[PDB]
Structure formats: structure tokens, C-alpha cells
Nucleic acid binder design. Structure first.
Lengths: 76, 227, 147
RNA sequence: UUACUGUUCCCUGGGAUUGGCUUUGGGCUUUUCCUGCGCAGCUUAGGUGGAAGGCGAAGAAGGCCCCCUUCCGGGGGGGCCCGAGCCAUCAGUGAGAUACCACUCUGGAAGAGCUAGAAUUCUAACCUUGUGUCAGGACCUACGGGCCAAGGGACAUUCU
RNA sequence: AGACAACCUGGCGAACUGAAACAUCUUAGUAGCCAGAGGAAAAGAAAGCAAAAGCGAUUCCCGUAGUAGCGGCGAGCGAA
């Protein structure tokens, strides 16, 4: 679905969850934000993903392909 | 035109992964006996039991269709009335201590010799001929017993005693790699079907982990006991 | 599952094709180090780096094994090393008159670092077992004529 | 409010980002050794098929000494002085079953390893502030972005 | 950008009240806040359902039962 909000880079925003132990209530859950470092291939950009896009930002041709000209270094 | 050793070769004609069956491991076990003279073919089986105990131990005999039976020329040699029960039983040749002078001449048209315990005194002298040729009767082999009748008639079927050691693996040469193909099949099959009926009631779960059929000096091969 | 290749204090050389450590390449070995990523895309590529290193067993060996074939029926080697002193000789033979003799007739040249320990000074038949590589060997004969 | 049912915050632990070595200490897969000699067989055989040819690049006698199983009545193995060369098996003897040649486990240790915990070090993040170099012409006390370097060090924090 | 009248998709998200008490539940995933687009949107030709008979896109209307089922199986909701 959609991971909560604590930044961007790829995912959208919050998507609260609930409970079921002994009662159901709307719990304001967060996300496993975190960040990753990447220099080689481009310029230093601290992309703070959500441990679920790490395979679509530094793996595929998301940016791995060191390209000279083009849009701003940042994903935007 | 190529130089080779004695392991790399055979190791190529065999596979550890694949589970070769009886019929398949037949035309293969013979190709793994590229050694001088006639090599013997054994069969190692991994039993899942406890060697420390005795109730888990296995001890019995297997009747090999080939190698023994009627093809063998067992010669009975006793005295008294034990000579009559020998011929009536179905022995190739029977005689008292008179035939003792026959074997000294060069007559060795036999492979199995049995006698009582009231003639071993003279038979012991044949320890120079029958002794080395393993033809001399011994209490262990059961070839020495007053009941020569049940003896000569017993070898008519041929059996091979087997047990379990401190490890738990059993193996008994069902023949050589010189015998025919169809033969090496009934022997191996009979060896298993027999030992299987000797499984201890204390055994729990799989009684057989894996079966193998190796020779004197050569790679092994996992044989399927079910087939 | 990665490709070490450059063995460095790690259990595995020339790339490991078997289960290996994890979380040790996600940000270290891979970046500015040794391009691993043992994936079906780099697998076939990795082979092209070793298969060409094995071909020398079916190609290079061929263009080196024929040495014993090309040199075996060649005419007798007539090289006079000055035979005198009543029975001894004057000329010296250590490796020159053991390989340079190949050029003595019908061009052709061979390295001198392919001969075993020299032979005693005489005039009889010599056994110069030509040894190129530790995989193939040849045979060469030498004779002397009193000049 | 020491009424009940929940929750925010403040905390603890496991699983993830935190991965790579070393030291000590368990276990498992088990490598190499050591008690399944009660008696008889003088010699410790834990055993089957050999049962008779083979073995010649993986431990085959004594005086003397120690350890390892019982120098600890006698044996096997590592060695200094003394110290024949092809060997062993075997009939008989004889226990239910006996050790050479070709193949084979436990309880408990050492070693090679897998793995669950403490205790150290460095570094590949991460955290953070911090000489300085930068987005210059920002001749403004400042968040943020980047290079280099220093410090802590993959033990927070963050998420479930 | 219209500080956009309703309809529609999506994110987030009550209480009063009902349960003749009330924290489960129900009452509202309504109202309300916010984002986007069309004038239709959404959905849509199907790893469905049924069944060993066969139908066979989605959506909408009338039935099949407001039975079955679910629930301090209480209130109440409500299939195919």
C-alpha cells in the first residue's frame, strides 16, 4: 500500500493502522524511515527512504546509471 | 590417446546425486571393477538403531539364489548310520574314511565338505589340503554336527550370516562382478528382502537411511531398496 | 550470494559461487571495492573471465604438445664438438650444443631453457630429452664426429 | 483517589538499518584417541564376506624412562644408548563369536567448523558537533545542501 | 486561479444517541476537514461462481431470505 510520512523520496504519506488485541482502535503508527548514503555514481544525496524503496533507488536504473547532463542531480 | 589414473575415470561413470536402482546399478557395478582378477561386490546399508543395546542388534541369514544351492557339489563324509541319511538327503557323494585316500591323489571335484565329530580326528590331518582350501569343516560354519542330514539339505539352499557391529551398517558380498546381470539382481534383492524381515521391534521411524553397493576398491552408489 | 573475485582476508577466492556472508557488501565491498552482485546477469559474464583461462588446456596445450611430434623423425644431429685428446674432447657443451643444433639445419630455433642437466663429455649417443612445459615432453638425439 | 477499562509520555528486551575479526566459555554436525579381558583361549577379537593371494609414497618385537586406557603382574603409541629383514594369517588348539590384507559407531576430551551469549579493536555506514574548503561577486547574527578532516563508533536513535 | 451547487474517487476521522446504566458493540467509517478529476466517475471481459449440469465483463433495478450467518449471539447489523 502506502508507507507513512516522515519525508518522501518515493513513498507518499501516513497510513495509520489499528489494533485487535482486546479492542479495536485507530492507532497512529509511523514508518521505518531511515536513510542511505550514496556517492559513487553521482553527487552526495542523503535519500531518506522507508526501508522499502532501497531496491528502487540504488538498485535499478533509478540513478545508479551515472549520467552527466539532465535534470537536477536530485530526484525531485 | 590419453593418460589416466584409476579414480578420476570410475568417478566419472558414476553419480552420487542420482538414485540408481537395482537394474541401473547392474550394468554399472561391473564397469567399476576394472581391476585384476575377479573382484567381489558388497553392499553397505545404514540402519537406524542403537548398537549399545542388544535388542536393536540384528542377526540372521539370507538365502542367495545364486552362488549356492544345487549348483554346488557338497560332499558328505561320515560313519555309522550317518552315511545313509546323507545319501537319502540328496548329497553329491558320500563315503566314510575310505575316500580320505582319494582326495590325496588329486580328486577335488567339490566345493563344500561336511563331517561329524567322530571323524575329525583323521580329517584334521587334511589340514594341509582341506585346511587352506577352507574345505575343512568347522563348528562355526555348522558343517560339523551329528545332524548331517539337516546340514547337507541346508546348504542345498545356501545362506550368508550377517549382523550389526558397533556402528550399525551391514554388508555381505552377494557375489562378484564376474557373474551374469540377471543374477546380480536376484542376489542383491534377496539380500535386502531377507534382512528387512529381521528388523527389531524396538526400531522407530525409518529403519533404512540409505543403501549402497560398492566393491573391493572403488566409489559407492546409492541403491534403491524399494526396487 | 556475491562475487568476491579479489580475495582479501575472506573465505573465498576468484568469486564465491556458494553461500557467503551478508550485510558486508550492501555498503563497502561493492562500492569502491569489488563489483560482486552474483546475479544471473553477471554469472555468464563471470564465466567469460575464467572459461578463457581454461581454454589453454585444449588450445595452448595443443600448440605445445606437437613439439614431441614435430621433432622425432628429424635426421641425425651431426654436431662436432672437437673430439681428440686421445679419447676426450675440446669443445664444451652445456646447453648451446643441445638446442642451438636445431638451427644448424633448415633454420628453426628453440629456447635453451628447455634442456635437462648436460651429458658427460664423450662421442657416443646423447639423450637430450627436450622439456618444454611440465605437461608435455619430447626427445632429441645428439652425435659427434671426429674432425 | 491504592474504582474500572484504555491511552500519551517516560523505560526494558527481541527482530531490522549493525557488518567484519579476536579472546574465554556451551552445544550440534562429529575428525582423531580412550574402559562393552566375566570365564576359557598363556597373548584385550567390538565384527561380516576373504579363507588364501596380496601388500612395496596415511604409526609392523626387546633391556631402560614417562604419559596416555590401568609405568600403575605382562602389552599398543612418541623417543636417547643396545637393537635380525620381506610379513602375516593357519591345521591342531579352540569360546557362542578370535585380532593380519580390502571397508565400518556412542558417553567423555583436544583440533578443524556451524551457531546462541559476554568481553576487546578497527573500519564500510549511522549520530553529532566541529579547523577549514564550498553553492563564488551572501563587503548580513542564521536553518539546509556538498568536499575534506576530527571525534564517538557500527552499543543510540527511528519502526514493529 | 474559480476562494468552485450537487453527484464521484481517495487520505484522515467523532460525539450526542441506541445498547431503557455504561467502557465491547451499535449508533457514523455519516456529519465534518482536505486532495483530484470527469460530466460521469468508480468499477469493468474475470488464479470468478458454480459444479462434475453449465453459466460465464463490470455497473444498475426487481426478487431470491431482510433466510443463512455474525454479535456482552443482548442491542443491532445483515450474505450469497
Amino acid at each position: 500500500r502506502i508507507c507513512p510520512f516522515t519525508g518522501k523520496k518515493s513513498n507518499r504519506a501516513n497510513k495509520v493502522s489499528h489494533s485487535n488485541h482486546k479492542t479495536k482502535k485507530l492507532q497512529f503508527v509511523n514508518l521505518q524511515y531511515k536513510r542511505i548514503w550514496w556517492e559513487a555514481g553521482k553527487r552526495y544525496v542523503k535519500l531518506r527512504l522507508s526501508t522499502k524503496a532501497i531496491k528502487t533507488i540504488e538498485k535499478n536504473g533509478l540513478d545508479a546509471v551515472a549520467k552527466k547532463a539532465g535534470i537536477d542531480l536530485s530526484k525531485k | 590417446r590419453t593418460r589416466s589414473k584409476r579414480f578420476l575415470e570410475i568417478q566419472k561413470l558414476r553419480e552420487i546425486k542420482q538414485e540408481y536402482d537395482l537394474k541401473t546399478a547392474l550394468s554399472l557395478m561391473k564397469q567399476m571393477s576394472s581391476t585384476k582378477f575377479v573382484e567381489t561386490a558388497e553392499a553397505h546399508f545404514r540402519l537406524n538403531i542403537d548398537p549399545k543395546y542388544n535388542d536393536q542388534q540384528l542377526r540372521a541369514t539370507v538365502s542367495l539364489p545364486k552362488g549356492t544351492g544345487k549348483t554346488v557339489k557338497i560332499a558328505v563324509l561320515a560313519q555309522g548310520d550317518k552315511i545313509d541319511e546323507a545319501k537319502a538327503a540328496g548329497a553329491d557323494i558320500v563315503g566314510g574314511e575310505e575316500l580320505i585316500e582319494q582326495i590325496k591323489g588329486g580328486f577335488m571335484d567339490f566345493d563344500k565338505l561336511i563331517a561329524t565329530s567322530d571323524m575329525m580326528a583323521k580329517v584334521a590331518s587334511l589340514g594341509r589340503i582341506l585346511g587352506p582350501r577352507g574345505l575343512m569343516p568347522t563348528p562355526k560354519a555348522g558343517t560339523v554336527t551329528p545332524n548331517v542330514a539337516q546340514a547337507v539339505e541346508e546348504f542345498k539352499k545356501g545362506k550368508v550370516e550377517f549382523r550389526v557391529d558397533k556402528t550399525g551398517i551391514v554388508h555381505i558380498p552377494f557375489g562378484k562382478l564376474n557373474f551374469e546381470e540377471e543374477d546380480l539382481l536376484i542376489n542383491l534383492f534377496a539380500t535386502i528382502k531377507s534382512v528387512e524381515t529381521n528388523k527389531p521391534t524396538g526400531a522407530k521411524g525409518v529403519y533404512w537411511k540409505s543403501a549402497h553397493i560398492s566393491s573391493s576398491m572403488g566409489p559407492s552408489i546409492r541403491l534403491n531398496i524399494r526396487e | 550470494k556475491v562475487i568476491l573475485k579479489e580475495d582479501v582476508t575472506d573465505l573465498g577466492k576468484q568469486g564465491q559461487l556458494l553461500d557467503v556472508k551478508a550485510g558486508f557488501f550492501r555498503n563497502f565491498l561493492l562500492p569502491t571495492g569489488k563489483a560482486q552482485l552474483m546475479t544471473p546477469l553477471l554469472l555468464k559474464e563471470l564465466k567469460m573471465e575464467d572459461e578463457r583461462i581454461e581454454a589453454e588446456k585444449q588450445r595452448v596445450k595443443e600448440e605445445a604438445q606437437q613439439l614431441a611430434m614435430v621433432f622425432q623423425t628429424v635426421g641425425a644431429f651431426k654436431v662436432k664438438r672437437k673430439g681428440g685428446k686421445g679419447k676426450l674432447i675440446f669443445g664444451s657443451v652445456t646447453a648451446q650444443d643441445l638446442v642451438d643444433i636445431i638451427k644448424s639445419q633448415l633454420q628453426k630455433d628453440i629456447d635453451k631453457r628447455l634442456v635437462s642437466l648436460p651429458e658427460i663429455r664423450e662421442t657416443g649417443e646423447y639423450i637430450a630429452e627436450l622439456k618444454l612445459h611440465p605437461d608435455v615432453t619430447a626427445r632429441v638425439k645428439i652425435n659427434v664426429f671426429a674432425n
